[PDB]
Amino acid sequence: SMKCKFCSREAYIKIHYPKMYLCEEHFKEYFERKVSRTIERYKLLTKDERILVAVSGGKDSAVTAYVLKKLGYNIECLHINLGISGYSEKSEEYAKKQCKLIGAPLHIVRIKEILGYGIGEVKTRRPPCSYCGLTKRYIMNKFAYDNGFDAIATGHNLDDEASFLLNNILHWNTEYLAKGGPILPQQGKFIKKVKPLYEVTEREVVAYALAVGLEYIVEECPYARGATTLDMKGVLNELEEKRPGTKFNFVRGYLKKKKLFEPEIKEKEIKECKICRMPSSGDICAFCKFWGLKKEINFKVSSTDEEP
């Protein structure tokens, strides 16, 4: 077995791009520095901002919160319990454990308490994974807005971006290809969304979580029909194995040529929801229409979990 390129310790991991062997400690430092560089590169965050980390219970958002906290950022965390019996309880417990170890405040929103129904419970023909993303994205935006947070940070890694690009390139979804990247800058009541793990691989995320002692959910959604992302991920991993830096250069190259997909948006119709005043297309937004809401949900909090 090879040793660390920086110290006299057994190598914990081998980085393929650039090729090197690092120990448990020099990898942690490498990872943290690589995330720090991503935040500097695309001017993601400042240390004065109040950051809201959307924590799922999985590795990605747990490591996002951990690294940002270690780098000395002003973070708070949000976990959305989608009320899936036999999945949401374990995921909520995992998020609690993570935020406890990280030492960051955790806010929990239970959709079965707010909207009455959990995900998969509503009388719908549409799959539960479709209105899932709509429910999470809205709740994390309105929570951040209602509580005056400057930015939202998600767990999306290099593999997530590479697979999203590959999938939309294959389908020629030029509108989705124009809206990618590490920053979704603040547009009205839409809080700034950032991806600090944009240039780190899922493999590096797994190794970092194991090293710092972060326990997480690997379990995918039980309501899922098809493994499209896993198919794209496996394919890009095969390509990466032969040519290291494939994922990186594909994503970085895309940022240089994203401008070409920009004339595809052509959208200029902006409205405010009659129920919650959040950005809408028409009288009522997709969220209030789907959940059959007559009144606005206020996510503004004073007394957070274990606080007065």
Next chain:
Amino acid sequence: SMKCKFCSREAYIKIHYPKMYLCEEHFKEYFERKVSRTIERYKLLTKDERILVAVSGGKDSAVTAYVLKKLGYNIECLHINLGISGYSEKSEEYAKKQCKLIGAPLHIVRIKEILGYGIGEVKTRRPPCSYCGLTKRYIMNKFAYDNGFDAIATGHNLDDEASFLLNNILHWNTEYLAKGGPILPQQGKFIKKVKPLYEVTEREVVAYALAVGLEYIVEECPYGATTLDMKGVLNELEEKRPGTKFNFVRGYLKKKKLFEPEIKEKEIKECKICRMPSSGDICAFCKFWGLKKEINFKVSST
């Protein structure tokens, strides 16, 4: 084993896009019709045109020539012997066999006779496979031009296009992405280049060549497997979701226009030596081969 969707014969192949089982005869008919449809779709060729099929000795160009001949087109074939000792002789023999079975006239150009050196004999740091596509593309263009051919047809299949797109999307080669598709329309001394096999898979090409009795070289140059890596990956994707390769290529044709502003167009000049399209005084071909005079490919086919 399933039977043919059209007759009482054992199925030879299972087409996945669109899903159906066909026999040796109904597959031949389907393949031929699918190629006919490609020629109609992008207005590739007319039956009055004199077509030059660039035959390598491999399956693709052999099937291109065969199908065009069967569909009733005016074809002639060109084989370029790159003088690679232990490769070029077998490839020339394979092309002869193919054109004999097809029943199409075959013209042979030996680069070791014309340029003095074979590909891999010239004192160069760069690999031969780089100045190979340069030598082939030039010779097949000047041959077609010198002999008054209306179009050049190559063996490029759906897999070749899908892998080229995937490779240039991964590298974000937006200039190469603007110049793709089934037609390279005639621009001056550059003859119209077409891809009749644009919508047929390599798997369908292998099955067609075996059915009609075409023998070929399973082309692996003696001088990296980037294309095979892209092909294997797209085959994996196709196995899970059929029609991936087709929708990727067809979708690309709808959005090719987006890569067009990445033109970066330079002044169009004529070569001081051979008058063929050039960037500067002398073209890349005459510069590399150190040519002082023009090569005339004009032939009197008795």
